[PDB]
Design a protein around this nucleic acid. Sequence first.
RNA 1: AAAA
Length: 644
Amino acid sequence: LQGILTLGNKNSGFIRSLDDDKTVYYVHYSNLTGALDGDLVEFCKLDKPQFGDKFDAAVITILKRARILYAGNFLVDQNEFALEYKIVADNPRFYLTMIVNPDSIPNNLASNTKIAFQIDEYDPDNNLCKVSVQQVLGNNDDPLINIKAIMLDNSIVFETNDVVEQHANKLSFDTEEQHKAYRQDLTDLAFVTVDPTTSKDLADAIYVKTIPTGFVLYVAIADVAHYVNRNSEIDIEAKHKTSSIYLPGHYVVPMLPEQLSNQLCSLNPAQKRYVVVCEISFDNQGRIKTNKLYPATIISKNRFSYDQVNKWLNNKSELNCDETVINSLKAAFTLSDLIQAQRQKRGTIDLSHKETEIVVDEHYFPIKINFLVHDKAETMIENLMVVANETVAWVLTNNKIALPYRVHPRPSKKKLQSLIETVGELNITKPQFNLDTVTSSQIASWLNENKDNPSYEIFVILLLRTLGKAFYSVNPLMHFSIGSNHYTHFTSPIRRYIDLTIHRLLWMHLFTPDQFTDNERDQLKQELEKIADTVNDTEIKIINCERNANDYLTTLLLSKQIGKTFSGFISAITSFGIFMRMDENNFDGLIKITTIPDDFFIFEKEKMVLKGRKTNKVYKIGDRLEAKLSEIDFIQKRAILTLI
RNA sequence: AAAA
Ligand SMILES: [Mg+2]
């Protein structure tokens, strides 16, 4: 009777019920009754016999709109001495016909101006609605304006909140905080930061010491909880955002205002900074022996980029730093190699595969797509952050403190069987493990025995699909791909609300519990599930916003390459055609089913192939193809290919 | 899937 609408292909879709089974009903376009993608609706099952698979339904009323504002392009034209207004919504799932309120239209608003509009009224029976312009965003051809519109359509806040900035600008460095008995003075240690070249939020610094029996690792994380009081205005805004947002052009929407993100909580060189340290001692094989968590004070001696460290590694450059930094980095790389070997021994799933970024010019127009490369410096930092995250998760669990975990379940036997069949057609080995009990180690060994297969890329793509998304949970579930029974996010409280919450839990229960009330502790405990829920729901939106922006920028880039031939492989097959991932740009283009040459092709959902009725020719995931870019679909932001 |  109640559920969330999702619109898909041709603006038909389905409703996922709120009942305990999450029962799914199909809904055709004609039974939507004015409802839009993501709306909460009241629905009824259709009296129809079941066509199969699922029941069908019709929307009765809209209980809550998913959005109040919608992006679109505003058009104005004059015809028989009268102004006519039209809006084209950016979102192809916005299917309602719009009547534009003339009193919402400024006299100076020109044609082809991006706007945001709201729905004033709608007629569910005719799919007609009255809308008013609520914001003027800018030139509709401007790619940065489009990126901002795409954030608005995904409910992603990006405008500066002046109240929050003013609250932040009051904050200052308390010089006496370093003298607190609970805060360890580590200002003499050769901490440094290692980050991408354009990052200005330095949340994490590392220092590694060698001892006779092994190593001691210090991971120092900006002490964000010490500056951001829970339920302060700054906190509430961070909780709404849930995370910093990173889109192309190094365009960042920070979770926290820049007085925190780039000054008080940024571990900038030669500045005294307050941190939370995860300190771990290792033996000479990289096995963890002991750990300690505590507030501290550091002075980073150097900020480095991945590029700088990597060139140093390959003896193609020197680092202009003190010898203590040089020895710490050398020990960090040695330790990092050892940690990586232990984690592989215990079981971990390295799901690395091809990644790209879009290069844009100073006006945010896309220039080209670059493939990213494995990064020795980036990998070292990754190993160190992972071991800290895992250790903090276990410390909180060992002390029986409820926390939000980062979790990732074992996939079902069913989904594994499907994956094994698909990749077996690409000469990927059939695995030997039990499908009910398969461990992280066994998936890793299976990946490793196929590393040289030409189809390794789509193998990892499909494995990732099989495994599904990681998410946050207070329930103590495993992280299958990291390979731990307990994992959380601790190292990045400048950009992630979960890490900020993890730091608050450390403060309130382990660092200075005497300074907090039992209610504060229970209140936060009671709120943890809802925090995880909001972060999980917003993470969906962020990923969708990145997808929208990627498709917008890449199809704009490709719009100048019509007629060009691209080689690639099939990444997906649907009832409407073949998705071919192009080698040169890693982007999926659509080959429409109806115009594939030489035969009439039928979608078979079981093996998810297209099979020709006369010739038995088969298209399957992984096949190598060549195709011509024939058009850009600017409505759906798709690249359409035709087989050549 | 992980890492800033
Ligand atoms: Mg960092």
